[PDB]
Design a protein around this ligand. Structure first.
Ligand SMILES: CCCCCCCCCCCCCCCCCC(=O)OC[C@H](COP(=O)(O)OCCN)OC(=O)CCCCCCCCCCCCCCCCC
Ligand SMILES: CCCCCCCCCCCCCCCCCC(=O)OC[C@H](COP(=O)(O)OCCN)OC(=O)CCCCCCCCCCCCCCCCC
Ligand SMILES: CCCCCCCCCCCCCCCCCC(=O)OC[C@H](COP(=O)(O)OCCN)OC(=O)CCCCCCCCCCCCCCCCC
Ligand SMILES: CCCCCCCCCCCCCCCCCC(=O)OC[C@H](COP(=O)(O)OCCN)OC(=O)CCCCCCCCCCCCCCCCC
Ligand SMILES: CCCCCCCCCCCCCCCCCC(=O)OC[C@H](COP(=O)(O)OCCN)OC(=O)CCCCCCCCCCCCCCCCC
Ligand SMILES: CCCCCCCCCCCCCCCCCC(=O)OC[C@H](COP(=O)(O)OCCN)OC(=O)CCCCCCCCCCCCCCCCC
Ligand SMILES: CCCCCCCCCCCCCCCCCC(=O)OC[C@H](COP(=O)(O)OCCN)OC(=O)CCCCCCCCCCCCCCCCC
Ligand SMILES: CCCCCCCCCCCCCCCCCC(=O)OC[C@H](COP(=O)(O)OCCN)OC(=O)CCCCCCCCCCCCCCCCC
Lengths: 598, 504
């Protein structure tokens, strides 16, 4: 319980040791240090969870020191552990440990093996700091650490410049998100004098009784930071392009660390969002729109990895939809189950890439169900959990809790968008499955955890997040059977469209409206194009305009005038004596006339 | 009583560096190291014995130590030194950067190394004198005195790759900028002294006497403008910034002249110590113009840093952007933003020192500063690209480094005062991340763009590694535990802020 700081210290020690080793150690020692550091973090998390449940699930605060203290500006380096923090810490440490041992098997014979494990250890430490902070500034430290580690791990193969461009794009878009989060922090400290989550929740209704404008501004900026980190609208363009790194970093980013920080941020500051209901409805709308656009984008991708990236964007949209409909338990439950099955899917896709001699186009693949059965089984059950197959997958129960929470709060359009997205996610997931596959301890743990056994785990969110309004029994059963029917219908439609000879699919893909819509959704609705010609191109144009330093030349103007005036004055020194006498006479005339006029 | 020795030990040490050169060509570096370590140790002892953490704000003036000696009694000019928390932090930073500068040029075995070390110690003593002087004439004297060895170091000992005329031109531009702005400040100082002499009837160049000077509105604005023109040239504030990238690019290649000459922020200290207390009302009316000059400095410096093909020029423009942040902090009247400005001054000094030392070692390795010729250097060098990655990470305002603490405390206080300028400046922090990533990717990542970068390069020596890792440790400790630094400068900042907001 008091070893809550060990979950930060052990990954930090692993990063420091593996960074200063500089690749001199063997791969066995580097694997032992990195994987064992995250493993001891997971073991300490298990002991922490046992102790937390052993004393009535009481919130435990462990302060370490005071970070900053200037007058009323007091920011503490403290950790807090409640049910939400325990859930996030448990999923981060456990799934990161599984991904770490899979990467220990996976990254063998690679340059920067110890560098890879140092960067992933720093990623784990930053996310543990993010989820175990009681104030917004320490959470911001974990936020930036997670973004920096994402940038370092995405461009891990630094030799290819496109990996570096993907990493730079990821860091820049998420940094715009962090600027919005910084605005939220500035507003909240200026209004309430504190950044401690419990303290702002306590002091906000008294302070904002007369006026509630800056609270809406602060929650809107919190939402902007969240959509920056979680790759939602309008800061979602980095995810698909920047999943060009190695496979375990994509599993870590899309399952445990990167994309769940926005969900955790909205869930943690739920009281302030409760005081601003319009911004909460905006959170729900942003999630719904993002999940629909991500599903349509995943429907036309030609790589396994990009399909999985837009699927991650859709599932984070489902979590944002659950947050916007005041279904917080459903959002965290879907976070945990999606971490499970998305980690499983990304690890299986990495095994596909390794076995397929570095091939990524799905159409060049075919009939891989007989080449390897275990990878096909992992992809099958991960797709079933992604498609919310009823009663055999945890994703069904998570998405059904989300849809029930949207139904019970009077949200019709968000629930309709969720059902449409469920049909679309069955469609794109098994389109990828049937195109690719027709025509081991981490994998086992994620294999069982992606089934209903993962749905047997209940996050201890009672007393942290408010209870969702319960649905009527008949309405809940009709929603259950409607979601199951929609998922099964999408399964059968994908089977009818892609399992055999794709005649109808190719006929409507090659049509002019079909080609237009396919090339529109393939580029993710043109947001990359819009941000290139709205932010990137004027930045580069202003840089090329200013590369001469115009202000320096403007301040060099007086020197040029000095040279010109001096060269002009030197013409009077021609060396002629009679001109010197004439100039003395001219000066005498000027002096005498000036004395006469004054 | 130790402040005269704080200034004198560098001067005597530079004289002994020149004199002991005849005993051997490896002797002046040891002498410079001993006297820079002695200056650092004396400043650390002043820090330990000052008790700055338990010091309350009693109002300007409030000095932990003070020395006075008559110098030119006809004008009421004295050697008047005084140390308090802000000056002490700046002096300790100057001593640490001076030790780093001596260690940085350790492998210079040239025939005239004693004169190099004398010029270095004279620059460092002048900077310490700027931080300690409260007599206005003495402050101006140190201000303009530290530029002659700077000029000669740039002109004669500078970048070997460039021809002589380019180094002469850069040194001349730097000298003309700094001395003309200093003469405008001297005009302002003289006019303030004459206004006080007409009001009272006595000659004084003392800071404490000149504080209580009744001036009309408009005269005070002009004196403030002269002071600000000097400080804006040395900050640098746009457009008075053009001397800085050429002074950095033509500085000696090890980096010691960047550390000793530029990276000590005497102009921000001068704005806090003199411009705000002597002319508080004029500074209050100048606050919007100074804030927008800082905003333009942030964004202009970021765009210039991105557009550089020279890595040293890039780091110089990063310095311009960070000082735009500090300039926004200074004119805001907030204690939180002032403390952030102090942290940002120290952290920018440390991070720019690390960047410049690493750039000098990289130029020693590959014999070119053009980033279009170096690429994929992560696979060629043992330590340098990782430490350069750390320092570029620090310069974008990474939490865990002191740059984040300074920048964000500045932004918190500024938002409490001026919100629009603050939001534009945070987008400037995005611009900072852009130029840092661009430098990192153009230098150390990717494929080799020439033949020199395609081969293995020698590893960093133990001395270079030690000084870089010391800078790394100090920046990390400043990021995670900035409280001793905040407690050291709390009383001085409180006095300056209370004087500024109680007189407006
Ligand atoms: C609150 C908990 C934390 C929460 C999140 C915090 C986030 C912010 C963290 C900021 C720290 C810097 C992060 C980025 C570091 C980048 C440098 C790095 O790790 O480089 C890796 C490199 C090893 O790579 P490799 O390829 O094997 O090298 C062989 C040839 N170069 O390494 C090397 O070559 C050698 C090492 C180079 C420098 C490594 C980083 C130094 C700074 C961190 C440790 C500082 C020392 C610890 C003590 C500080 C004082 C108490
Ligand atoms: C993760 C966090 C560390 C990130 C890496 C940077 C290294 C640590 C640098 C900051 C050190 C902070 C520190 O020592 O603060 C002083 C604090 C005691 O000071 P005080 O504020 O009075 O605490 C209340 C006393 N009951 O001292 C303490 O409370 C001592 C214990 C601090 C917690 C462990 C610090 C080291 C952990 C990382 C090792 C690698
Ligand atoms: C419109 C309504 C909705 C608005 C939503 C909020 C704003 C969203 C902004 C999203 C911006 C996304 C694009 C950013 C990509 C940056 C990375 C990139 O383009 O990398 C490629 C390239 C790498 O090369 P490099 O090492 O930099 O060297 C340059 C020489 N070619 O890099 C380059 O060539 C340089 C790229 C510079 C990019 C500068 C971006 C500035 C962004 C400012 C955002 C302001 C928001 C207000
Ligand atoms: C209301 C929302 C309804 C959502 C579900 C729509 C289901 C039907 C359309 C999507 C499935 C489909 O038929 O996709 C075909 C095609 C992509 O097929 P693909 O596998 O990429 O191409 C193989 C070429 N050898 O798809 C395309 O090229 C784009 C076809 C767009 C059809 C109109 C969609 C309107 C909404
Ligand atoms: C904020 C603005 C308002 C307040 C300003 C206050 C004044 C002080 C602070 C600003 C100083 C600006 C100085 C501008 C010139 C800087 C020096 C320079 O650019 O020198 C260039 C050049 C040396 O280069 P070189 O290669 O040796 O020459 C070629 C061969 N002849 O040099 C030469 O060739 C000859 C140089 C002669 C001296 C330069 C001319 C100075 C004249 C006084 C200017 C005062 C400011 C005017 C108003 C501001 C500018 C619009
Ligand atoms: C190119 C670089 C050099 C810059 C150009 C040269 C300097 C230009 C300075 C222009 C000054 C214009 C003054 C206009 C009013 C003059 C008449 C007047 O009423 O003066 C007021 C006062 C003398 O009258 P008195 O009876 O003493 O009033 C008491 C006032 N408290 O007057 C006084 O007490 C003295 C007023 C002094 C004003 C400041 C002068 C220096 C300012 C700093 C440098 C310039 C700005 C950059
Ligand atoms: C090349 C060198 C240029 C030097 C220019 C000096 C201009 C001096 C103008 C002046 O004297 O303005 C006087 C006015 C008020 O000052 P004063 O008359 O002393 O008022 C006392 C009454 N209470 O003063 C004011 O109201 C303020 C004057 C500001 C002058 C700014 C100069 C330009 C700076 C930016 C350049 C771009
Ligand atoms: C080179 C340029 C690079 C790009 C730069 C972009 C700059 C964007 C500037 C937006 C300015 C917005 C604005 O006017 O905000 C001011 C307002 C201050 O409100 P306030 O003064 O506190 O009102 C009550 C009094 N206490 O602020 C607020 O009320 C909210 C503060 C946060 C504003 C966020 C702006 C970005 C939103 C993107 C979506």
């Amino acid at each position: 319980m008091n070893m809550l700081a060990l979950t930060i210290i052990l990954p930090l020690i692993g990063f420091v040791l593996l960074a200063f080793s500089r690749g001199r150690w063997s791969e066995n020692v580097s694997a032992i240090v990195g994987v064992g550091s995250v493993g001891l973090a997971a073991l300490v998390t298990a002991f922490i969870g046992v102790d937390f449940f052993a004393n009535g699930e009481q919130t435990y605060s462990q302060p370490l020191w005071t970070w900053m203290s200037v007058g009323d500006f007091n920011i503490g380096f403290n950790l807090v552990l409640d049910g939400l923090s325990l859930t996030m810490l448990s999923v981060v440490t456990g799934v990161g440990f599984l991904i770490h041992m899979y990467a220990s098997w996976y990254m063998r014979g690679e340059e920067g093996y110890s560098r890879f494990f140092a960067y992933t250890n720093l990623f784990i430490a930053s996310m543990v700091v993010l989820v175990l902070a009681d104030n917004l500034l320490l959470m911001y430290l974990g936020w930036e650490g997670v973004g920096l580690c994402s940038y370092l791990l995405i461009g891990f193969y630094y030799t290819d410049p496109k990996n570096g461009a993907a990493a730079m794009k990821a860091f820049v878009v998420t940094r715009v998100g962090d600027v919005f989060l910084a605005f939220a922090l500035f507003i909240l400290y200026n209004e309430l004098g504190t950044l401690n989550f419990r303290e702002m929740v306590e002091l906000a209704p008294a302070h904002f009784a007369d006026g509630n404008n800056m609270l809406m501004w602060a929650t809107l900026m919190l939402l902007g930071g969240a959509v920056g980190k979680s790759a939602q609208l309008p800061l979602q363009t980095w995810l698909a392009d920047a999943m060009a790194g190695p496979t375990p970093v994509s599993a870590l980013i899309h399952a445990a660390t990167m994309v769940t920080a926005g969900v955790y941020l909205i869930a943690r500051t739920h009281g302030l969002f409760l005081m601003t209901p319009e911004v909460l409805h905006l959170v729900g709308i942003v999630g719904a729109v993002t999940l629909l656009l991500a599903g349509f984008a995943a429907l036309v991708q030609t790589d396994i990895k990009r399909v999985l990236a837009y699927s991650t964007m859709s599932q984070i949209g489902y979590m944002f939809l659950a947050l916007g409909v005041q279904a917080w338990d459903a959002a965290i439950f879907h976070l945990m189950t999606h971490a499970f099955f998305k980690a499983l899917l990304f690890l299986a896709s990495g095994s596909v890439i390794l076995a397929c001699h570095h091939e990524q186009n799905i159409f060049k693949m075919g009939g891989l169900r007989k080449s390897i059965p275990l990878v096909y089984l992992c992809f099958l059950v991960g797709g079933a959990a992604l498609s919310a197959l009823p009663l055999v997958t945890a994703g069904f129960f998570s998405k059904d809790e989300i849809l029930a929470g949207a139904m019970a709060n009077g949200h019709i359009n968000l629930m309709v968008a969720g059902l449409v997205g469920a049909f679309m996610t069955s469609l794109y997931t098994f389109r990828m499955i049937f195109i690719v596959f027709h025509g081991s301890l981490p994998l086992i743990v994620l294999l069982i955890l992606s089934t209903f056994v993962g749905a047997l785990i209940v996050p201890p969110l009672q007393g942290v997040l408010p209870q969702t309004t319960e649905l009527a029994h008949g309405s809940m059963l009709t929603l259950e059977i409607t979601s199951g029917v929609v998922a099964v219908v999408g399964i059968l439609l994908a089977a009818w469209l892609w399992l055999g000879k794709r005649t109808l699919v190719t006929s409507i893909a090659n049509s002019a409206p079909g080609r237009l819509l396919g090339t529109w959704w393939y580029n993710a609705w043109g947001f990359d194009w819009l941000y290139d010609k709205v932010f990137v191109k004027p930045f580069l144009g202003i840089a090329w305009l200013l590369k001469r330093d115009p202000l320096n030349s403007m301040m060099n103007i007086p020197a040029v005038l000095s040279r010109f005036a001096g060269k002009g004055l030197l013409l009077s020194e021609n060396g002629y004596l009679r001109w010197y006498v004439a100039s003395m006479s001219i000066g005498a005339v000027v002096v005498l006339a000036l004395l006469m006029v004054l | 009583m130790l402040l005269p020795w704080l200034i004198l030990i560098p001067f005597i040490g530079g004289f002994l560096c020149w004199q002991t050169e005849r005993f051997g060509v490896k002797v002046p570096r040891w002498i410079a190291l001993i006297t820079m370590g002695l200056t650092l140790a004396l400043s650390l002892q002043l820090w330990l014995q000052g008790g700055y953490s338990l010091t309350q704000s009693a109002g300007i003036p409030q000095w932990q130590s003070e020395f006075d000696m008559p110098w030119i009694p006809r004008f009421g000019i004295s050697i008047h030194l005084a140390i308090d928390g802000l000056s002490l932090l700046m002096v300790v930073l100057t001593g640490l950067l001076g030790v780093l500068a001596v260690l940085c040029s350790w492998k210079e075995i040239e025939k005239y190394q004693g004169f190099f070390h004398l010029n270095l110690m004279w620059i460092l003593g002048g900077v310490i004198g700027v931080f300690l002087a409260i007599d206005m004439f003495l402050f101006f004297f140190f201000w303009e005195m530290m530029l002659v060895p700077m000029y000669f170091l740039i002109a004669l000992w500078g970048h070997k790759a460039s021809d002589g005329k380019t180094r002469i031109t850069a040194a001349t531009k730097f000298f003309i900028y700094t001395q003309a702005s200093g003469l405008v400040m001297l005009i302002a100082i003289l006019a303030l002294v004459f206004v006080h002499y007409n009001a009272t009837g006595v000659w004084t160049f003392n800071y404490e006497e000149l504080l209580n000077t009744p001036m009309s509105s408009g005269v005070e604005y002009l004196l403030m403008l002269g002071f600000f023109i000097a400080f804006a040239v040395k900050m640098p504030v746009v457009p008075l910034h053009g001397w800085l990238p050429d002074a950095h690019s033509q500085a000696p290649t090890a980096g010691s002249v960047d550390l000793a000459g530029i990276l000590l922020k005497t102009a921000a200290y001068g704005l806090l110590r003199f411009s705000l207390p002597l002319f508080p009302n004029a500074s209050a009316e100048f606050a919007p113009i100074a804030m927008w000059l800082g905003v333009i400095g942030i964004f202009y410096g970021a765009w210039m840093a991105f557009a550089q093909t020279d890595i040293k020029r890039l780091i110089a423009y990063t310095s311009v952007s960070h000082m735009g942040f500090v300039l926004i902090a200074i004119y805001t009247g907030s204690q939180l933003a002032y403390q952030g400005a102090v942290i940002q001054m120290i952290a920018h000094g440390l991070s720019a020192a690390g960047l410049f030392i690493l750039c000098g070692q990289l130029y020693e390795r590959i014999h070119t500063r053009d980033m279009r010729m170096m690429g994929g250097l992560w696979s060629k060098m043992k330590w340098l690209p990782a430490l350069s990655l750390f320092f570029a990470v620090a310069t974008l305002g990474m939490p865990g480094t002191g740059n984040f603490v300074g920048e964000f405390m500045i932004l918190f206080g500024s938002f409490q005062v001026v919100p629009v300028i603050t939001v534009i400046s945070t987008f400037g922090l995005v611009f900072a991340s852009v130029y840092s990533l661009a430098m990192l990717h153009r230098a150390y990542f990717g494929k080799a763009k020439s033949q020199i970068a395609s081969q293995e390069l020698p590893g960093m020596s133990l001395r270079e590694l030690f000084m870089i890792l010391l800078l790394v440790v100090l920046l990390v400790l400043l990021g995670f535990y900035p409280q001793p630094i905040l407690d050291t400068s709390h009383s001085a900042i409180g006095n300056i802020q209370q004087w500024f907001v109680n007189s407006v």
